[PDB]
Amino acid sequence: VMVDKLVGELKLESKNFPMGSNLPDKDPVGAKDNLFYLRGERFRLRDFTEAPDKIPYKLAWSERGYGPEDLQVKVMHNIYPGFDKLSLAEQMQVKVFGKEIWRYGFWDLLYRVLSNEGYQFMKDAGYEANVANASAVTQLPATEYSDKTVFLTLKKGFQALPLTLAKRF
Amino acid sequence: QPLDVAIIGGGVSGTYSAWRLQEAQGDHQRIQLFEYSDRIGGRLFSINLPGLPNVVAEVGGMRWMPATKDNTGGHVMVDKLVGELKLESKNFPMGSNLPDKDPVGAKDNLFYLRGERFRLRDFTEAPDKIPYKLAWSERGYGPEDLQVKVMHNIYPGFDKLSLAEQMQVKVFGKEIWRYGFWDLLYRVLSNEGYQFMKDAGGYEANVANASAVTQLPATEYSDKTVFLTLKKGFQALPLTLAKRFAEVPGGLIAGEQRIRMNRRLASVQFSDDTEYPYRLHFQATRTVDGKTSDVPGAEEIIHARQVILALPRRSLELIQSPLFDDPWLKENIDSVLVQSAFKLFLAYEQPWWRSQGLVAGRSVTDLPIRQCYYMGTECEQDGGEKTLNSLLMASYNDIGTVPFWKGLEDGAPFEGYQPKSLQGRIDANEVVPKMQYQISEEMVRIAQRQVTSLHDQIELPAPYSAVYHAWDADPFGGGWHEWKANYRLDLIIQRMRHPVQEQEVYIVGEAYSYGQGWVEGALTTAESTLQDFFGLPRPAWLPEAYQLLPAPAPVDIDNPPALACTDCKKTLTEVTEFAYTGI
Amino acid sequence: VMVDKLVGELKLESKNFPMGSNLPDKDPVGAKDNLFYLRGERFRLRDFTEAPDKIPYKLAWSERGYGPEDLQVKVMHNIYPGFDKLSLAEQMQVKVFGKEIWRYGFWDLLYRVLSNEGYQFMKDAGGYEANVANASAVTQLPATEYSDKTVFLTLKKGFQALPLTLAKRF
Amino acid sequence: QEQEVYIVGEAYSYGQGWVEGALTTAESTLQDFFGLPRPAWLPEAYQLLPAPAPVDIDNPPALACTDCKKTLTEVTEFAYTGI
Ligand SMILES: Cc1cc2nc3c(=O)[nH]c(=O)nc-3n(C[C@H](O)[C@H](O)[C@H](O)COP(=O)(O)OP(=O)(O)OC[C@H]3O[C@@H](n4cnc5c(N)ncnc54)[C@H](O)[C@@H]3O)c2cc1C
Ligand SMILES: Cc1cc2nc3c(=O)[nH]c(=O)nc-3n(C[C@H](O)[C@H](O)[C@H](O)COP(=O)(O)OP(=O)(O)OC[C@H]3O[C@@H](n4cnc5c(N)ncnc54)[C@H](O)[C@@H]3O)c2cc1C
């Protein structure tokens, strides 16, 4: 809100920072037709669901047939249904296999609820870093990376907000 | 009364330094070694887990390459002082001696990468089972074997060149030492064959991008390579030294004041005493159960003629001194990459691995354990207990930070369980050793969980004892050091013995040796300093044959004369036969 | 012993029990060639080691290449190296997964020391069929009495001969 | 132990499912309670029925791993077969 409305008062211009194809406009293929090149095998984002045989990760039967962004949400609910819709206050009291979830690094969790071939997977296909074991209460509902969510960019470049903040100062 | 020399840091480097000196120039000068902690040996650490009193769990150093008969090759320094100080040495096995007839060695040792299980033999026996898209050319070489194919592919014989000649070898129009290690391999290997070697070979997640001139002839770690660890555990050497130091008859100072422990150097300063331009302001340091913290007390100051710093990179970085301002020493303390080291030991009443035709060596996996080593069974040891108690070593990953071996360091502590073999001999509060780090009820459970999987098992017998340790804490901030790239190790290997000439300060340690991550590296750096800058001679136990340090190439690597090749008629022939192996 | 020595003092006729084949004279198949017909796939005793592909039981990797006996022996050395190289008293004092081995029912141990597929296997391939006993494992585990090299004997006049000869003698 | 009724058979023997069971039970029952000698044909070595463990094994003394140097070799060599 702060960024959308501040750009508001500062009357700086906005563009829709595009994450997918709007072509065709009959049926945009979003990013479905966007590329993936892991374990010396090429496929697409559509292949994850449309042709899970094409994915060269020996993941379990329970994990087969989900894109990685969709698999994060499976893990979350598996852990607890609704985490995303909880308040931080509440999300801190949530516990997994005994410990509160914020006592888990983001991978000291994944390697307990996913297969190692799901663990290695998500990694290769997040920024390898991704979280380098960031608290799991922050890094688990990181399911806004989608092309389904919206994103706006400054036309004059994002650096125009702090510059325009300096000048008006 | 003031000190002529102050060998600061009680590492294998320090302990060797003070010894020879007092031995020779000790009635002639006031020599004193200064230790941070309650323990000599430094990285060399040797605990005996309860129930395994004859299965040393070397947390730090473990083995050493035996000397060759020409004595110019092998960990010559280590392997002659192990005789001189007279210390017991057993073979460090990497393979299985059984079957006596046709010893499989490490061939049968396990691999679990990308959720598929094979063995070292399945490389040269059935590559079909490697679940990596290695290109035709590369398909059929073992991790070790591959590295050598690449090496050769570069400048045939790279392993045969002296450091001097090696440095001058360019590849694709660049000095080999200008490339890192991976940066190189991601131009000679398929991106799978790259990934593949990054998942198996030598250490682990380590093999960090380091000067290719150090890390390309790093194939030594094979199952044909002989190796020995001290019976008493590697810490034995830098203690017999620490003892032997204070045990020299001819001395100005008696043995009781010679080895001053629980003394951490915080400031080296230029005094006014033109004879002791070194005001060392130490601080009191107390060690409770491996965790040494500071006693605010008073910064005790002792006057020194010279201070032989036997410290690795952080250890140094931790002293406040105008000496580190020297522009060279400012930018040549970053010549080496700090890389952390973790390690888990688990004690079992049964070596369940034997039931599965694995004896000694390691097994590799895409699981966080990444590595695992089978050590030995107490009763297999020469005049050991009559127990089937045994030791599995692991957590031998090796990475920057926030990995998965620091992600389970918290919760509740593992107490373990009194084995039948230690009933009324030791208490369940005393089974799991209290170390600097206390392995948790959680880290044990996950480790075991993972170990099970690795070995394709349903459930293994729970361990009774378990210790975790790390070298990611100051005063080390890292296990072993590896030379960075676009650096001239050849020169720095020489000039870190005396960073500043005018000033009589000498830094010794593996941290700036050719033998980085080796005890040889720390002995060599010390010895070649004693000889050049303290005029100590070659002792009787060291051959002259063994060149201590390697030939520094000229500073003029600008367009030097081309290296006149030798027996290509041989070289190229060994290079071609070596490629018939993989076909 | 008692049978081998009683049939001695009773001077009764002994003959070999061939749990296998004697041909060819040079290098006998022993059993090896003997038939199996599990899970609608036919195979032979050899095809366990020679040709594991052919075994229709999806056993784990560590479990492939043994016969049902051989497998049992692995498991037993797993439970405790040289468990068969003990006395009964010593065997009652061996603990696995916290419990004395003799508090486990056979199967109830296998499932925790073997794959289900390996479990089923051994339950679909044993000596006395339907070994089903969940019997004190301390007795039924070291049953390494079933092979093509394990020497067996019978009585020419049949095993009923032993009781009768005693009854006669009596 | 008050009565004079004795039970022999394969059922309550270490030799269950075998004859030897029947023969071993009976003999010891005779050698012990019927005062019979040991047949000159039945060798002293052969222990008929196995000996029991103490009736308290709640905290058993650790078995003396006499020879592992031998045992662990074979256990290993046994594994190398199934590779
Ligand atoms: C995990 C691991 C495995 C290894 N395995 C092997 C192996 O198998 N074979 C082999 O040959 N080598 C091995 N090595 C290498 C071996 O540990 C080194 O050769 C050796 O321990 C380093 O000696 P050093 O003198 O360079 O310093 P260290 O041994 O690190 O000694 C440094 C000393 O400085 C002291 N110190 C720190 N700060 C201060 C201060 N302010 N004042 C005073 N003292 C201070 C410390 O307390 C310590 O005693 C291994 C190393 C690691 C980390
Ligand atoms: C299918 C099968 C295969 C076997 N294979 C082998 C083998 O290969 N090798 C081997 O060594 N052993 C084998 N055995 C076991 C072996 O036959 C027995 O262990 C042996 O017969 C034991 O004799 P016993 O006296 O203990 O009991 P039994 O043979 O049962 O003797 C009991 C006797 O008492 C009689 N009886 C029972 N109740 C009464 C009553 N109320 N009044 C009077 N008489 C009564 C019975 O009719 C019988 O005559 C096998 C058993 C079976 C069933």
Side-chain angles (χ1 to χ4, degrees), chain A residues 1-10 12-15 17-20 22 24-25 27-57 59-63 65-78 80-109 111-122 124-127 129 132-137 139-142 144 146-147 149-152 154-155 157-160 162-166 168-169, chain B residues 2 5-6 8-12 14-16 18-20 22-24 26-27 32 34-39 41-51 53-61 63-68 70-71 73-75 77-79 81-84 86-87 89-95 99 102-119 121-138 140-143 145-153 155-159 161 163-169 171-175 177 179-185 187-197 199-202 205 208-210 212-218 222-228 230 233-242 244-251 254-255 258 260-262 264-268 271-278 280 282-285 287-290 292-298 300-301 304 309-319 321-329 331-336 338 340-343 345-349 351-357 359-384 387-395 397-398 400-403 405-408 411-420 424-440 442-483 485-488 490-494 496-501 503-504 506-535 537 539-543 545-555 557-558 560-565 567-568 571-573 575-583, chain C residues 1-18 20-24 27-31 33-68 70-78 80-84 86-122 124-127 130 133-144 147-153 155-156 158-167 169-170, chain D residues 2-62 64-68 71-83:
Chain A
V1 166
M2 276 213 65
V3 181
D4 196 40
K5 299 289 139 155
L6 181 51
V7 169
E9 199 53 90
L10 302 181
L12 304 168
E13 220 161 2
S14 38
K15 73 174 138 202
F17 179 70
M19 305 274 300
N22 70 283
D25 229 343
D27 185 64
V29 299
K32 292 132 56 78
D33 257 304
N34 289 16
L35 245 166
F36 268 90
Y37 182 38
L38 317 151
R39 311 208 151 163
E41 224 277 270
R42 251 167 246 94
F43 47 99
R44 310 257 170 203
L45 187 75
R46 52 189 334 124
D47 297 339
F48 276 121
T49 56
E50 295 195 18
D53 289 345
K54 286 187 164 178
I55 325 310
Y57 291 75
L59 62 80
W61 177 85
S62 64
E63 299 157 351
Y66 297 89
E69 194 104 48
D70 319 313
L71 192 55
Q72 199 164 28
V73 211
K74 196 192 124 269
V75 162
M76 185 194 313
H77 293 127
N78 293 353
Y80 180 98
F83 202 93
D84 34 19
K85 323 123 180 120
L86 290 164
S87 97
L88 193 63
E90 321 178 86
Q91 290 167 358
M92 293 308 277
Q93 310 200 339
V94 172
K95 312 201 209 151
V96 214
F97 310 127
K99 341 203 312 212
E100 289 110 333
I101 169 143
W102 52 263
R103 303 189 158 268
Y104 279 101
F106 186 72
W107 312 102
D108 303 304
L109 185 78
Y111 70 35
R112 284 158 137 292
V113 295
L114 279 190
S115 56
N116 209 97
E117 275 288 75
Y119 178 61
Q120 284 286 293
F121 164 58
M122 297 263 283
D124 302 7
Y127 356 76
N133 281 288
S135 248
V137 173
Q139 262 292 324
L140 195 57
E144 63 185 342
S146 43
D147 83 321
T149 39
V150 249
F151 285 111
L152 286 173
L154 276 190
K155 223 171 127 167
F158 221 174
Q159 202 196 355
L163 286 169
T164 297
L165 278 168
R168 282 267 227 115
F169 169 39
Chain B
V5 296
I8 323 290
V12 61
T15 53
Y16 180 63
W19 174 60
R20 221 148 86 78
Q22 190 97 357
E23 279 265 320
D27 30 41
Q32 267 209 345
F34 288 87
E35 229 322 300
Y36 199 107
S37 45
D38 80 337
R39 192 185 50 83
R43 287 181 254 176
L44 290 216
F45 197 175
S46 286
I47 48 158
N48 272 104
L49 262 83
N54 300 233
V55 195
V56 244
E58 263 128 278
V59 225
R63 66 184 182 277
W64 76 80
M65 218 160 322
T68 53
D70 59 78
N71 302 320
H75 289 215
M77 279 231 54
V78 186
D79 201 23
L81 183 50
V82 153
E84 180 58 67
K86 298 106 179 52
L87 291 148
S89 57
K90 64 179 180 180
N91 192 268
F92 192 105
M94 312 255 278
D102 211 39
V104 300
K107 284 185 222 126
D108 271 311
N109 290 52
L110 177 63
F111 276 87
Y112 183 34
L113 309 173
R114 314 209 140 170
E116 277 279 312
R117 268 184 217 83
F118 52 100
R119 351 191 78 108
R121 60 172 212 151
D122 298 3
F123 285 121
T124 114
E125 286 205 17
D128 11 301
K129 327 165 97 135
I130 320 305
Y132 287 101
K133 291 248 202 150
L134 295 174
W136 200 72
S137 31
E138 328 197 333
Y141 289 90
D145 282 2
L146 197 48
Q147 198 172 4
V148 189
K149 196 207 97 182
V150 184
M151 178 144 69
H152 287 177
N153 257 108
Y155 180 81
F158 192 87
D159 46 31
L161 302 173
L163 194 66
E165 332 191 34
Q166 282 191 326
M167 295 295 280
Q168 314 202 353
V169 168
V171 178
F172 309 137
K174 210 170 162 208
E175 334 94 46
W177 54 265
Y179 281 129
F181 177 61
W182 300 123
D183 317 318
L184 179 61
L185 296 198
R187 289 150 139 283
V188 219
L189 292 174
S190 82
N191 188 66
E192 277 291 67
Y194 163 68
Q195 295 286 311
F196 148 65
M197 270 232 65
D199 293 356
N209 249 320
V213 178
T214 61
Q215 283 255 316
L216 203 54
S222 299
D223 71 287
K224 293 179 179 179
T225 330
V226 224
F227 279 109
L228 321 158
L230 283 173
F234 221 165
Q235 210 185 2
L237 188 105
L239 279 176
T240 301
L241 281 174
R244 285 281 308 275
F245 166 52
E247 272 191 321
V248 171
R258 279 184 217 176
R260 294 281 308 276
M261 311 273 305
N262 288 296
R264 162 199 81 110
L265 196 40
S267 45
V268 179
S271 86
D272 289 345
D273 194 286
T274 135
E275 283 44 66
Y276 299 102
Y278 302 127
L280 313 178
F282 287 98
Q283 184 66 56
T285 22
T287 316
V288 247
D289 305 315
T292 311
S293 64
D294 269 290
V295 195
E300 189 232 71
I301 335 263
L309 299 180
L311 301 173
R313 201 188 99 164
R314 185 124 188 76
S315 302
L316 300 161
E317 279 160 337
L318 298 187
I319 314 193
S321 184
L323 188 99
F324 301 125
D325 307 343
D326 162 24
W328 188 89
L329 185 51
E331 235 185 55
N332 274 302
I333 212 138
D334 328 322
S335 38
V336 297
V338 124
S340 295
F342 316 117
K343 209 178 278 187
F345 294 78
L346 299 152
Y348 306 101
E349 338 188 69
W352 41 259
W353 43 88
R354 302 302 293 273
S355 325
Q356 310 179 34
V359 170
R362 93 153 150 167
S363 301
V364 223
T365 179
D366 66 316
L367 308 149
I369 38 171
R370 290 277 285 113
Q371 291 196 79
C372 128
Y373 292 69
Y374 319 109
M375 294 338 233
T377 327
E378 164 68 41
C379 63
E380 267 193 317
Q381 314 302 327
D382 195 301
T387 77
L388 266 194
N389 306 18
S390 295
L391 185 58
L392 185 82
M393 188 221 91
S395 201
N397 194 15
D398 267 308
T401 30
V402 248
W405 282 151
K406 258 282 184 329
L408 304 166
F414 181 67
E415 291 275 296
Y417 80 75
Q418 210 192 53
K420 23 175 80 132
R425 318 177 67 201
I426 213 140
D427 286 292
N429 36 45
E430 294 156 352
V431 162
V432 167
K434 276 186 306 198
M435 308 276 284
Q436 185 190 340
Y437 306 94
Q438 311 286 353
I439 201 165
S440 84
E442 204 196 344
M443 199 187 274
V444 162
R445 221 286 299 188
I446 292 301
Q448 192 87 152
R449 230 197 42 186
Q450 277 195 41
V451 164
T452 330
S453 242
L454 174 57
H455 297 85
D456 197 30
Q457 294 297 286
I458 3 71
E459 214 176 358
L460 286 173
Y464 61 85
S465 188
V467 328
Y468 167 68
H469 193 60
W471 316 89
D472 73 309
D474 330 324
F476 309 129
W480 81 94
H481 302 88
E482 272 291 343
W483 288 114
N486 257 337
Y487 274 95
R488 286 290 304 280
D490 61 301
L491 301 183
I492 316 153
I493 268 161
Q494 308 283 325
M496 200 44 91
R497 312 178 314 177
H498 212 204
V500 195
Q501 260 77 52
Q503 293 299 279
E504 269 8 87
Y506 317 89
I507 304 163
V508 285
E510 68 84 40
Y512 300 99
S513 62
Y514 193 45
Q516 281 187 320
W518 301 111
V519 157
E520 189 81 344
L523 285 194
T524 44
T525 48
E527 179 48 9
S528 78
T529 303
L530 293 171
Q531 288 183 356
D532 295 342
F533 297 104
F534 298 99
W541 47 277
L542 213 51
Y546 185 53
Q547 213 212 323
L548 295 168
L549 291 187
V555 217
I557 322 260
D558 289 345
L563 306 158
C565 310
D567 201 338
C568 322
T571 313
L572 290 180
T573 300
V575 130
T576 308
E577 285 200 17
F578 178 76
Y580 290 142
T581 69
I583 310 161
Chain C
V1 161
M2 292 231 42
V3 185
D4 206 13
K5 297 304 183 164
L6 181 48
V7 172
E9 196 74 12
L10 289 187
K11 266 108 184 94
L12 279 176
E13 298 256 333
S14 167
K15 63 153 315 276
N16 177 261
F17 203 85
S21 161
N22 218 61
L23 295 161
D27 175 64
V29 292
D33 266 355
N34 282 35
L35 256 166
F36 288 76
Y37 174 38
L38 302 162
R39 289 196 175 174
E41 306 263 339
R42 310 216 157 75
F43 59 90
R44 318 264 192 181
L45 182 74
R46 57 214 295 162
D47 286 337
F48 287 137
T49 89
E50 294 174 6
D53 261 11
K54 298 189 175 185
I55 315 309
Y57 289 77
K58 293 319 119 159
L59 275 66
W61 186 72
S62 31
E63 288 173 355
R64 283 165 217 157
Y66 297 106
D70 298 303
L71 192 55
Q72 203 175 323
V73 181
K74 196 210 52 150
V75 161
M76 185 198 66
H77 285 138
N78 275 318
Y80 176 97
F83 185 82
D84 64 319
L86 300 181
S87 98
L88 179 61
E90 301 185 295
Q91 286 165 28
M92 299 294 284
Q93 288 185 40
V94 172
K95 284 129 94 34
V96 225
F97 308 107
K99 229 193 303 196
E100 297 105 299
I101 177 155
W102 62 270
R103 309 192 133 245
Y104 285 107
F106 197 67
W107 312 109
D108 282 320
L109 172 83
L110 302 189
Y111 79 74
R112 295 176 64 186
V113 307
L114 273 150
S115 74
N116 207 65
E117 282 302 314
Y119 176 66
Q120 306 271 285
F121 176 84
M122 296 240 16
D124 278 19
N134 246 335
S136 187
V138 93
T139 51
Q140 253 283 1
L141 191 59
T144 73
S147 94
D148 63 82
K149 36 257 154 189
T150 304
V151 215
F152 277 113
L153 298 177
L155 285 175
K156 283 214 352 191
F159 224 162
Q160 200 181 352
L162 181 54
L164 300 167
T165 307
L166 285 161
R169 273 266 207 152
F170 163 55
Chain D
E2 281 78 21
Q3 299 323 282
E4 278 279 342
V5 193
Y6 299 93
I7 316 201
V8 290
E10 62 109 315
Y12 306 90
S13 350
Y14 193 48
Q16 269 169 177
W18 300 121
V19 166
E20 185 84 340
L23 295 189
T24 54
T25 39
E27 183 66 22
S28 102
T29 313
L30 304 165
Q31 274 190 51
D32 286 335
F33 308 110
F34 282 88
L36 295 174
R38 170 195 52 109
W41 52 257
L42 187 48
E44 255 182 0
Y46 187 54
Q47 145 154 21
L48 275 66
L49 290 176
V55 213
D56 162 41
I57 49 161
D58 292 42
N59 271 98
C65 177
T66 59
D67 204 1
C68 39
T71 312
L72 291 179
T73 334
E74 299 146 40
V75 166
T76 306
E77 276 196 306
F78 187 76
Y80 291 146
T81 72
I83 286 176

